[PDB]
Amino acid sequence: ADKTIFNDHLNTNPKTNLRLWVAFQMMKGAGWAGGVFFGTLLLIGFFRVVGRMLPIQENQAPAPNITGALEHHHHHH
């Protein structure tokens, strides 16, 4: 009893190692990297930009304002 209806041991098996390597790389790589990067960036990125309107404007303007700036060029003199 040895090879006949037995085998026993992993015997390295390149096919098994290859699948394990690719599986881990794809899972951890695509999942973690792609998941967190693409997932978070897209979620928080798009939501934060559209929601908060970060890109320009924001809400107001640190400028004194007072009452706008110029409705259509005026002159009080």
N-to-C CA span, the chain: 110
Q: What is the CATH number of the domain that holds 14?
A: 1.20.5.920
Does any domain span residue 44? yes
Q: How was this structure determined?
A: NMR
Number of domains in the chain: 1
Alpha-carbon span 32 to 28, nearest angstrom = 5
Provide the CA 52 distance to its chain's centre, in angstroms: 18
Alpha-carbon span 49 to 54, nearest angstrom = 5
Question: What SS3 string covers 19-70?
Answer: HHHHHHHHHHHHHHHHHHHHHHHHHHHHHHHHHHCCCCCCCCCCCCCCCCCC
Does any domain span residue 21? yes
Q: Residue 4 is part of which domain span?
A: 1-55
Does any domain span residue 68? no
